[PDB]
Write a protein that binds this ligand. Structure first.
Ligand SMILES: Nc1ncnc2c1ncn2[C@@H]1O[C@H](COP(=O)(O)OP(=O)(O)O)[C@@H](O)[C@H]1O
Ligand SMILES: [Mg+2]
Ligand SMILES: [Mg+2]
Lengths: 194, 152, 197, 104, 264, 193, 97
């Protein structure tokens, strides 16, 4: 035609694709910076573990002193160890599980009391539990189990106030098929106790 | 960020290292040995565990001119994490004994490798004091009283 | 110049805020910093280039000698863009950079862009001129930032440093308005500039 | 000498064991690869049939392939010599004291 | 239909479109500087990872000890004031460095019990009770994971599926054949209908009557069809003099069944 | 003849003593590697001025237990600060065993002998040391030719001749067929004290 | 307030630097300030406590930003006529000028 903007527009068409392409890429490259970061941290976490080093477990066999303990090592020999500034002697006591630096054999921190694998299997059992409320019926019987068990666990405050001894122990017996298991499974949820 | 530096425990490794390092650059006559200190930081107790030299120049004609090599600080970090990851940059020693105002500006630099305010550990290597072979100071920024400005 | 190390100064200022090249003078300077670095590498491939800030009272080392364009490029975005150039401090901090180097077979060059006039006393640059040429250091001043409305204080400083030895100062006169800054560098000496005997 | 004597108690394949665990899942890695699909970070590990041996102090270790024999020759229930502390098969030993005993 | 062409002459003025175009050339110059910046950053960052990786490769390398994870105890982040530890350090939050949060306690075949800072290499989800684990010979740190081995006691009990016997080939006794289909196959195939309804699929079917009435043949046929494994368990064996030994295989067979489930 | 072949007095500075104990005790129960940097003068005097710790190795101490990437980089950093010295030896630990060279460690000494033939090998136990005089001994190889033809002893001339030794075990066997032990001499100034 | 929130979505990216969030806080002191004169003192108080929070998690706080904050806080106290509470707030305003 007569226009030189008609000649310009051909060229301007080529340009158009370029902006779009550059925008696609910019968005990808930022996402990539982030992706490599996570990978980098995690490789570095292995390395923090290699310089941190393992530790030895025993159990306090007997208290010798505030600042001396008889521990029985898992590896083998009974030891007298020191107490670190970091572990408080209020935590330390006889028969509690312990862990210690390998280096100086100095109690690092205490452990929670560990469990033998037999009793772990028992604890681990969970079916995702059930309601109160899907154990339905023999209403009055469910109510009384709650009275013995549940009522002093949540509120021992009422039992101490009155100055009565906490009520404890229940024995369940019935026919087969009556749901003692179904109820066992149920009471456990309601209160939330371990 | 934290303003936690209330107690500064020094390993004796740091004071003898600063003694060597002054003499391995041969700074004298109010020229200084500026190096890094590593340890743990972001904490109530700082333990100053290690010290290293860095490349550094100190000009006596104007105190706002000194040299520092940034690339050295980045490369030394890579290495020290492999030996020990409990070691990280926590700030800088300065030979002293004279604290200056230009040192606040060196301070700003070191605030770009550590989250906490950098610790400036004055270690007198000339052994003029019979006590204080460590004095410790930390730069904090606060509005000073008596009609005074915000001072760093 | 062949066999030269160069400390670039990116001018961080509120005259760099001001727009007299696209998008502003700061975004113009990213392009011109890339230009010089590659041009100089091609002409002699041993050439290697650092970058320091023209900002605050203290210039800070953004990069040391390197021939990855990516390390120099990264510092241009990272630095704070609003500051003031301080020529006196720059010459000295640049000079330290030129001290600490891979091999001193190379010429010591400072290339420094100007967007904002001096913020320091004149006479201090006259005294510093004789110290610069004493160690055979030259200073190239790109002037578009003192011919806006400013009288050119730059010329007398270039006179003082210039004296043939091996290194000679140049004054790159760059027109003050849009033409694209990189192109103005190019039309001025930047692969044919040299130190004279 | 001394090669402390051990014995194979398990053939655990080297590409089924999942030595790498960054991108690999424990069940298997590829069954003929472990980190040959990773060359993005440069780590190399394949091997075939690494075995689990049982020492005679009753300690178990994943040990090398033969370094003076081909791994074809080393089998499940075959005794083997491994280093003092570097625990890596150099020389196989016969599979027990079974010859001559059986033949009588 | 697009932009920056002859379509747009009608939408937007010839001078105004052309001057748009000039503006859009500037935008490329700004895109290039940003794009390169992001690019050089990935490349650099990539190198740092290769450095690390190689450091771990030496440790991962043979030999290494074999241990088994007794339990996992992962401690809480901030168990203390600022420590995932149960003791005071004045700060630092870590899981395997200054402060130990996550941990796996492993029992070595060297007869030791060792409390380990969890290593970042493996997942805490693989680490279970009796996960067989590679542990570094020197200092003790969970290096890698290993498949579980199974004893000869495990083997007898488990999978002895032979392909379907087929009911055509178990002659006579039409009703017995009818009952097994109804009990097993109908719930396994039509489980979706049992699920929507929320009724339970049979807990057991008791089969009783004199030997040699075909019963074995039938469960072995059914199991292949229904695509459940065939376990072989015989109660007269499990009667022993030893209380411990006799109780043990009941418990083993129950745990293994659920594992290999669905199972007949 | 040829080499003097008399065992050096190793003068370990205060900085270098404490640094070795620092890296060793963090690393227990494991071995540590490292290179010893100093100056050698006279014909039997090495002054170990400084040390640097080589990162923890995945195969333990061996002849591959120096990576050339760390090494080169590490010495390069000392050159930028003027703290530079020359590798005059190497240190390694046995963490649970007193001072001696296993088969691997002697073979490592054969490699360091190539680079400098007056090299020292120092064995530091980090935990057995409660004095810090004890369980640090230095070793240096005596020539192979010397061993065969029974010109092996020649370490008793040009020293004090006060010797300090114990153990038969590995220690002594190491001595007879290879290397010679001499006590660690501690150098200091009154600024460190 | 709209202009600056909008602006940093683009600008920060292209430019690669500069934070414009400093200026938001003065605007914010001024919203409370408007509330003070209109006699909605209660509203202004909440916005000043939300401002204060941002200040603490800044590494560097220029003097001008906290100066306006204290000016506002000063005005709040003299409406109640709590002489003591005004006096102590005003010294900080004066110092940080
Ligand atoms: N209905 C049948 N048709 C063909 N042979 C049968 C049939 N029932 C039993 N047998 C034969 O008797 C054997 C014993 O029966 P089996 O299925 O093993 O029984 P059970 O569990 O009743 O003891 C089979 O292996 C088969 O040889
Ligand atoms: Mg029951
Ligand atoms: Mg049968």
């Amino acid at each position: 035609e007569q226009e030189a903007h008609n000649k310009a527009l051909n060229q301007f068409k080529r340009k158009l694709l370029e902006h779009r392409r550059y925008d696609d890429q910019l968005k990808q490259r930022r996402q990539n910076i982030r992706d490599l970061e996570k990978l980098y941290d995690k490789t570095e976490n292995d390395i923090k573990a290699l310089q941190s080093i393992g530790q030895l477990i025993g159990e306090v066999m007997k208290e010798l002193s505030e600042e001396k303990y008889i521990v029985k090592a898992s590896s083998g020999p009974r030891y007298i160890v020191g107490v670190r500034n970091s572990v408080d002697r209020s935590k330390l006591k006889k028969g509690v599980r312990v862990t210690l630096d390998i280096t100086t054999l100095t109690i690092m921190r205490i452990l929670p009391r560990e469990t033998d694998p037999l009793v772990y299997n028992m604890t681990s059992f969970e079916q995702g539990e059930i309601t109160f409320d899907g154990i339905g019926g023999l209403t009055e019987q469910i109510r009384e189990l709650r009275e013995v068990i549940e009522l002093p666990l949540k509120n021992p405050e009422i039992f101490q106030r009155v100055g009565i001894k906490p009520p404890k122990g229940v024995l369940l017996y019935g026919p087969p098929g009556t749901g003692k298991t179904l109820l066992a499974k149920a009471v456990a949820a309601t209160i939330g106790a371990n | 960020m934290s303003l936690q530096h209330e107690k500064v425990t020094i390993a004796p490794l740091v004071l003898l290292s600063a003694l060597d390092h002054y003499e391995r650059t041969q700074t004298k006559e109010n020229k200084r040995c500026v190096g890094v200190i590593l340890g743990d930081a972001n904490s109530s107790t700082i333990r100053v565990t290690n010290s290293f030299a860095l490349p550094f120049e100190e000009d006596e004609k104007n105190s706002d001119v000194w040299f520092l090599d940034h690339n050295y600080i980045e490369n030394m970090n890579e290495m020290c994490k492999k030996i020990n990851a409990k070691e990280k940059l926590i700030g800088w020693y300065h030979s002293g004994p004279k604290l200056r105002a230009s040192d606040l500006k060196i301070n700003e630099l070191f605030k770009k490798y550590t989250q906490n305010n950098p610790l400036l550990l004055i270690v007198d290597v000339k052994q003029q004091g019979v006590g204080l072979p460590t004095d410790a100071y930390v730069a904090i920024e606060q509005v000073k009283d008596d009609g005074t400005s915000t001072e760093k | 110049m062949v066999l030269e190390a160069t400390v670039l100064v990116i001018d961080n200022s509120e005259y760099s805020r001001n727009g007299d090249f696209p998008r502003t003078r700061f975004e113009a300077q990213i392009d011109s910093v890339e230009f010089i670095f590659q041009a100089k590498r091609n002409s002699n491939p041993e050439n290697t280039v650092g970058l320091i800030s023209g900002a605050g009272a203290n210039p800070r080392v953004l990069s040391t000698f390197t021939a990855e364009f990516g390390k120099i490029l990264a510092g241009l975005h990272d630095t704070q863009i609003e500051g003031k150039l301080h020529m006196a401090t720059a010459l000295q901090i640049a000079q330290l950079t030129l001290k600490h180097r891979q091999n001193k077979v190379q010429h010591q060059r400072i290339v420094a862009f100007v967007c904002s006039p001096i913020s320091d006393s004149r006479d201090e640059l006259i005294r510093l001129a004789k110290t610069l040429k004493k160690n055979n250091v030259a200073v190239d001043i790109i002037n578009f930032g003192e011919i806006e409305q400013n009288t050119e204080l730059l010329d007398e400083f270039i006179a003082a440093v210039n004296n043939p030895q091996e290194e000679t100062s140049h004054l790159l006169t760059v027109t003050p308005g849009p033409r694209l800054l990189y192109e103005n560098i190019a039309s001025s000496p930047i692969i044919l500039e040299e130190g004279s005997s | 000498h001394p090669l402390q004597v051990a014995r194979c108690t398990k053939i655990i394949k080297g590409n089924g064991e999942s030595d790498e665990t960054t991108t690999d899942n424990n069940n298997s890695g590829n069954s003929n690869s472990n980190s040959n699909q990773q060359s993005t970070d440069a780590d190399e590990d394949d091997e075939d049939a690494k075995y689990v041996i049982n020492l005679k102090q009753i300690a178990k270790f994943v040990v090398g392939l033969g370094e003076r024999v081909s791994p074809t020759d080393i089998e499940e229930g075959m005794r083997v010599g491994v280093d003092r502390s570097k625990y890596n098969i150099e020389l196989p030993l016969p599979p027990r004291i079974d010859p001559s005993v059986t033949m009588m | 239909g697009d932009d920056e062409l002859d379509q747009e002459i009608l939408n937007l003025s010839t001078q105004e479109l052309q001057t748009r175009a000039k503006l859009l050339d500037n935008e490329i110059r700004i895109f290039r500087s940003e794009l390169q910046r992001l690019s050089h950053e990935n490349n650099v960052m990539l190198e740092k990872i290769k450095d690390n990786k190689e450091k771990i490769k030496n440790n991962r390398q043979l030999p290494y000890l074999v241990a088994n994870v007794v339990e996992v105890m992962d401690m809480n982040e901030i168990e203390d004031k600022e420590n995932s530890e149960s003791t005071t350090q004045g700060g630092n939050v870590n899981l395997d460095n200054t402060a130990v949060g996550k941990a796996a306690v492993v029992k070595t075949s060297s007869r030791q019990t060792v409390f380990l800072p969890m290593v970042g290499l493996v997942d805490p989800d693989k680490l279970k009770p009796n996960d067989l684990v590679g542990v570094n010979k020197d200092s003790y740190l969970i290096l890698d994971t290993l498949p579980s081995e199974f004893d000869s006691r495990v083997k007898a009990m488990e999978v002895d599926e032979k392909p379907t016997e087929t009911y055509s080939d178990v002659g006579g006794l039409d009703k017995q054949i009818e009952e097994l289909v109804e009990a097993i196959v109908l719930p396994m195939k039509r489980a979706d209908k049992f699920k929507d309804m929320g009724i339970r699929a049979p807990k057991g079917a008791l089969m009783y009557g004199p030997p040699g009435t075909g019963k074995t043949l039938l469960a072995r046929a059914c199991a292949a069809q229904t695509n459940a494994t065939f376990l072989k368990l015989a109660a007269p064996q499990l009667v022993q003099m030893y209380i411990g030994e006799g109780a043990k295989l009941v418990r083993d067979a129950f745990a293994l069944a659920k594992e290999k489930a669905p199972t007949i | 003849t040829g080499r003097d072949d008399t065992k050096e007095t190793v003068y370990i500075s205060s900085i270098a003593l404490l640094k070795m104990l620092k890296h060793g005790r963090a690393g227990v129960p494991m071995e540590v590697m490292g290179l010893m940097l100093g100056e050698f003068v006279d014909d039997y005097t090495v002054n170990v001025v400084d040390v640097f710790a080589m990162p923890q190795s995945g195969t333990g101490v061996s002849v591959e237990a120096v990576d050339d990437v760390f090494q080169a980089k590490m010495m390069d950093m000392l050159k930028q600060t003027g703290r530079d010295q020359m590798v005059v030896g190497w240190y390694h630990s046995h963490p649970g065993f007193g001072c001696w060279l296993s088969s691997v460690d002697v073979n490592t000494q054969k490699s360091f002998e190539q680079l400098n033939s007056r090299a020292v090998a120092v064995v530091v136990d980090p935990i057995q040391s409660v004095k810090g005089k004890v369980v640090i001994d230095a070793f240096r190889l005596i020539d192979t030719g010397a061993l065969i033809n029974n010109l092996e002893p020649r370490q008793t001339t040009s020293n004090t001749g006060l010797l300090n030794k114990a153990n038969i075990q590995a220690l002594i066997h190491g001595l007879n067929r290879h290397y010679y032990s001499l006590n660690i001499d501690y150098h200091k100034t009154a600024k460190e004290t | 307030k709209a202009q600056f929130q909008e602006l940093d979505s683009k600008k920060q990216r292209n430019n690669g630097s500069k934070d414009h969030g400093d200026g938001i806080l003065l605007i914010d002191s001024e919203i409370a300030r408007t509330y003070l004169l209109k006699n909605d003192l209660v509203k202004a108080r909440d916005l000043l406590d939300d401002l204060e929070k941002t200040l603490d998690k800044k590494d560097s706080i220029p003097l001008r930003i906290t100066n306006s904050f204290y000016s506002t806080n000063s005005q709040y106290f003299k409406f109640k006529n709590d002489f003591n509470s005004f006096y102590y707030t005003s010294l900080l305003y004066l110092s940080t000028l």
